[PDB]
Design a protein around this ligand. Structure first.
Ligand SMILES: [Zn+2]
Ligand SMILES: [Zn+2]
Length: 202
């Protein structure tokens, strides 16, 4: 039973054997994640070092189960203990993207860049975000134009220029920091496509 397993976790914590406490805690998540979650809120001392270990296991467990609401709750519980930790911010941001909170997820990634300019995780997401969002805007711009009048053609090419400097520029800035010291085929294949779109728009 899970209730018996949880007493071993409680005993291992009081005996100073944190290693086996986390091991039995991981096994209780497999048996019953709902009851284990309740044990964390009711019995675990939130001011101890072990608290963060137990919270991380529940966050990882809900993330694998596709329950993005619960995964966020626990990554947020970790984030309260260290608000400026880029790795803690990264974990919450990914769950907000999966839940559909696009705007709030965009904020957390931008906050990571403020704390660390060359952060690998934030620059990967944003580099792809701006490139993909600028690609759909470029298709909308071409579908409207493609009589025609040269005034409308001026407005068409100006849209391509404005969208490039505003959106594509931010995509390339993030993608260059990604391949600063760690090469990537996924990063370099996008940079040549941005370079291709640049010479067409002038
Ligand atoms: Zn991550
Ligand atoms: Zn760095």
């Amino acid at each position: 039973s899970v209730d018996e397993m949880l007493q071993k976790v409680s005993a291992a914590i009081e005996a100073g054997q944190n290693g086996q406490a986390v091991s039995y805690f991981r096994q209780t998540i497999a048996l019953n994640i709902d009851r284990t979650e309740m044990y964390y809120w009711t019995n675990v001392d939130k001011n101890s070092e072990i608290s963060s270990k137990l919270a991380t296991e529940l966050a990882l467990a809900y993330k694998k189960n596709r329950n993005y609401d619960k995964a966020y709750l626990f990554y947020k519980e970790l984030l309260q203990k260290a608000p400026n930790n880029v790795d803690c911010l990264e974990a919450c941001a990914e769950m907000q993207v999966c839940r559909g909170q696009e705007k709030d997820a965009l904020r957390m990634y931008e906050k990571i860049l403020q704390l660390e300019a060359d952060n690998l995780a934030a620059n990967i997401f944003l580099g792809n975000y701006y490139y993909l969002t600028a690609e759909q805007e470029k298709k909308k711009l071409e579908t409207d134009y493609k009589s025609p009048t040269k005034m409308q053609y001026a407005r068409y090419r100006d849209g391509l220029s404005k969208l490039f400097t505003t959106r594509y520029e931010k995509a390339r800035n993030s993608l260059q920091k990604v391949i600063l010291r760690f090469p990537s085929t996924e990063a370099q294949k996008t940079l040549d496509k941005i370079l291709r779109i640049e010479k067409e728009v002038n």
